[PDB]
Amino acid sequence: TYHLDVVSAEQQMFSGLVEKIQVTGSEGELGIYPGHAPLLTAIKPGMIRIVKQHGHEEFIYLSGGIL
Amino acid sequence: ENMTPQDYIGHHLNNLQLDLRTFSLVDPQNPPATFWTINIDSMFFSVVLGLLFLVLFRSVAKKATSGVPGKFQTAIELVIGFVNGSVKDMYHGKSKLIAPLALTIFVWVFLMNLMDLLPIDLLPYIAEHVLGLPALRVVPSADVNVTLSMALGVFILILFYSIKMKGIGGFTKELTLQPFNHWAFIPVNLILEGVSLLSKPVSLGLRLFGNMYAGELIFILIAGLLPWWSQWILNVPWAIFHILIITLQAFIFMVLTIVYLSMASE
Amino acid sequence: MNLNATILGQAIAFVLFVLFAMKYVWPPLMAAIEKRQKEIADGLASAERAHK
Amino acid sequence: MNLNATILGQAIAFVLFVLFAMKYVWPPLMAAIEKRQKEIADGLASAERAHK
Amino acid sequence: NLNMDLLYMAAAVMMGLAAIGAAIGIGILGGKFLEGAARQPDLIPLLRTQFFIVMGLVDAIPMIAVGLGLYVMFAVA
Amino acid sequence: NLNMDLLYMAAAVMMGLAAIGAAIGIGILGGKFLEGAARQPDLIPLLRTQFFIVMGLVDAIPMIAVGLGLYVMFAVA
Amino acid sequence: NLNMDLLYMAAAVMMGLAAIGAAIGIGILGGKFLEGAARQPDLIPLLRTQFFIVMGLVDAIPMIAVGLGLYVMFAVA
Amino acid sequence: NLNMDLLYMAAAVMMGLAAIGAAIGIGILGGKFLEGAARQPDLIPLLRTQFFIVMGLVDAIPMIAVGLGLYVMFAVA
Amino acid sequence: NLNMDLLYMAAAVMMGLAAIGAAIGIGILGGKFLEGAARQPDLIPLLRTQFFIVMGLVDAIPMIAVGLGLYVMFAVA
Amino acid sequence: NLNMDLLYMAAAVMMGLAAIGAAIGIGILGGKFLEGAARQPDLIPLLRTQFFIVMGLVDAIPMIAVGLGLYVMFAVA
Amino acid sequence: NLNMDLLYMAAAVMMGLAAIGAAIGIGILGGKFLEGAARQPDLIPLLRTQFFIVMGLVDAIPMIAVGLGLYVMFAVA
Amino acid sequence: NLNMDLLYMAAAVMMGLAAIGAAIGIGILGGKFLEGAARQPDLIPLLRTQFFIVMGLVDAIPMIAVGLGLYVMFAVA
Amino acid sequence: NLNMDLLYMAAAVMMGLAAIGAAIGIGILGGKFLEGAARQPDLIPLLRTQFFIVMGLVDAIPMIAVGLGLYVMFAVA
Amino acid sequence: NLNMDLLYMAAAVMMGLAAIGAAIGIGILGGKFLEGAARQPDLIPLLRTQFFIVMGLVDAIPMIAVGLGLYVMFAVA
């Protein structure tokens, strides 16, 4: 697992431990597993899927941002 | 023994055949020219493996438990679920034929290719020395006739579905207009769409044949050319690589068959 | 190599194995499998109706 | 040429091939079968609890 | 003899050019398959099916050339 | 005699070039299709439609060359 | 006399090299087309139009070379 | 023999290499054009005019080769 | 006489073009595998499994040609 | 006579190889020019200037190769 | 006699093409290895391990062709 | 006769491969020169200086090969 | 006699192909090395330490091709 | 004596192939040098240092092949 933060300029939105995430980067869908190489990208407005370790799935709506 | 290796290899390439117009077994060097001359030994193993498949699957199909399955049952249902998942991803019509056709192709071709792994001289040694028959080469899929028989069956199916599901008006409309959609192009498009359709099955058959035929030809060359102590070191790497070939060549035969029938009907 | 009557012989064996598999082998196995998968999903439907 | 030695070399090669095939190739298949038996046993036990 | 020896060279050309064409074309497609698998592993099952679909188109003419090469060297010999 | 013998080499060169041309062009187009699909899986049915459209165009000329190669081997022999 | 066989050789050379050129050129162009389509899906009919515009331009010399190879093989030889 | 068949072979070489060069060079150029067009969905005419200018450069030298091939086809032979 | 060296030359062509095709195809595939491995390192055993699957197809034609090369060299001298 | 008639093959190779080299090398250079123009359309005439500047070097060797090919074809042969 | 001429020519063409295949195939692989290392060198020993694993597959066919070239050159002389 | 013929064929290969080497090598180099220029035009004169230094190496070895080709055509006759 | 002329032709082929293979393989690998050093100038030590490691494998077969070319040119011919 | 003329083809082929491979190998390497320079121009002398180091290896085999090209054309002749 790895650590995930979803942070807005105002307040924090998620701080759990994750096994993987799926996002829509600007240049396409993108799925981050553990150990993934350093990367920087914008993300498009729309949902992110988290699977918290032990496999618990949830959807967070984001108005955009940078990953 | 009066074997030169080049002749030993020559004997190993030859089949056993029967003349349908004279009922004579064919000679080590003298074939009859008439096309009515069945390749008996590959037919024998081809049907023996088709029978063994249908026996095993019908035996579980009559036994089948809806509870926790038996271990053998588990392996047969595993392959049934793998086939069904592939078909249902690629195909969306109701046609009842597609799934059993894909299963029969996959399992039959897998078992045929699996016959090549067996030591090349052991069954020919039994068949000549015990039964006296002049030749044996056991891999059914290592002959063009079988793979073209299967490919031409699929070609007949492709034409049957493409007529049945969109009719001669649409079928000719596809074969004449696309790609360039104008009458002067229609003579050209009739050529291109015709040879494309002809290439789909024939390449289907030849893909399986070339890989299996050369796969056997390597074991023949390894047995003929090399001394006993050296034969294992080259043989083992090729046998284990061949396992990957035999599996992929079966799986590709199945998948391309489904892709062609789904593309034709839908 | 030698294109041969075996092409017909194999075609006959092929179509016979397809028809026996299609009627006799595929529906029994898929019916037992789907009967299990369905009755498990009926367990899921019962747990939802219980809570609701 | 020593045809008997060619059959000797084919036997030795097959013994080595079956050693590799049994030890590496077979446990992955048996583990996939036993995985699906575990998967079905858990699926049915959870549906059975949902009935009560 | 005058007629037979050249045929082995003609087949050797058919097989060599088919081997280059199939090996490089499949290598290119496989490379884009492995990139796609690296960006989104959950797609790997879906993309492997798309790989086999497109790979079935790639090797069709190379396999035609391999078949006719094996016919010339074995059948006409 | 050379009339008979050399025509198998002429077919061989036609089939080898048609195999390289078709396999490379389809390999590149398919690779760009697979990377596009991996980036945009919801687009996959749409892109697959355009892929078969554009691959028909790519495929057109090599099938001419293979068809004549078969006519040179069998028909004029 | 032997004078006809090399005309089949010439037609084999010219048609093969035209099939290589056309197939690889259309493969690269169509690949970049599909990349663009994958980014901007609503744009696909516009890009498809522009693709056809360049698509005709790449194959003009291949079409000349195939025409001349048909001329040599069927009409002269 | 020794005269005319070598002339047909030389023409086939000239025009086959011309078809290779022209088709690949414009295929690359058009691919970069389509990538720019998909990036700039408004500048399609502004870019395509530049494409026609540099395409004119790419096509002019193989067209010299095609004219020389047609000279050998009709005017020498 | 000529017959032996012409068949050795035919095998030498088959092996040379097979070695080019296999080496370039696996080089391209390996490059995309390594850039994928540098990206998702914990996935390296998974991606390596998919690499072996696609490598089996890339090797498929080169091994056909190698075997026929060995047949022409040893089996018909 | 063969002494002249065979020199046409030399001229065909010399100019044909110059044709593929010039067409692909300009096709690459023009493609990078078109991407530079597509990213910054404010900048087109300066890039067009530098493109013509290096395009002269690119053409320099091919144009002497075609010139000597024409000289051998017209004046020597 | 004449056979030694062609036996050395066959050995030279086979080993030369095997050298082109091996050298380019490893060069292409190695570039993606370097670019992957240059972004995050901590991976270098891991990626170098994978580099050797895939490089051993690259050399399969080229080294076979080298072995047959050596046998043709020394043992067949 | 043939003595004079073969030296012109030797020039045709020498100049044709030198034309390909010069054309591609500068086409690639100038393509990257144009990309770096399009990113930062104020930088253009410095990159133009480095480009001509690197080009001098690319351009020298073909140009000496062409010079040896002209030596073979004119002075060796 | 003829033997030395075709021996020198064979060695010429073997060394020309080995020079192509070593040149393109090192050119690609060096290009990615120069990128890597530009991305982290500080690491231009470690990257060079690797680059040599990869270059040894890239060169290993071409060095054999040169070695046997010199063996033929100066011992056999 | 035919011995006189055949050496010129063996040299012309060696120097033509060494010119293609050296010109493309330095063209690629210089391209990555130029895009490196356009990103960090203060580094341009340091990257020049590495570029000349790597260029010496790229040239190492081509200079050998041109040196024997001259030796065959002047000194064996």
Side-chain angles (χ1 to χ4, degrees), chain M residues 6-43:
Chain M
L6 301 164
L7 287 162
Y8 277 116
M9 177 58 61
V13 157
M14 202 187 210
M15 293 151 141
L17 297 174
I20 292 279
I24 306 301
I26 303 298
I28 289 176
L29 182 74
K32 294 295 180 179
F33 165 67
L34 294 199
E35 123 62 25
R39 172 197 302 287
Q40 272 130 152
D42 326 13
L43 299 173

Side-chain angles (χ1 to χ4, degrees), chain K residues 23-32 34, chain L residues 28-29 32 58, chain M residues 18-36 51 54-55 58-59 62, chain N residues 20-33 50-51 53-62:
Chain K
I24 296 185
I26 298 172
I28 293 166
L29 174 70
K32 299 312 195 294
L34 294 185
Chain L
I28 290 163
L29 180 69
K32 292 292 181 174
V58 174
Chain M
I20 292 279
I24 306 301
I26 303 298
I28 289 176
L29 182 74
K32 294 295 180 179
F33 165 67
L34 294 199
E35 123 62 25
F51 169 85
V54 179
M55 166 278 294
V58 172
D59 293 342
Chain N
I20 279 182
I24 296 177
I26 300 301
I28 292 170
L29 176 64
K32 299 307 197 290
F33 166 71
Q50 308 313 131
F51 168 87
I53 286 161
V54 175
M55 170 278 295
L57 282 81
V58 175
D59 288 338
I61 314 303

Side-chain angles (χ1 to χ4, degrees), chain J residues 17-44:
Chain J
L17 295 178
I20 59 171
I24 295 175
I26 298 293
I28 291 166
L29 181 80
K32 291 301 202 301
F33 161 73
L34 290 190
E35 187 56 35
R39 286 175 64 267
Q40 301 215 84
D42 190 46
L43 197 57
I44 296 170

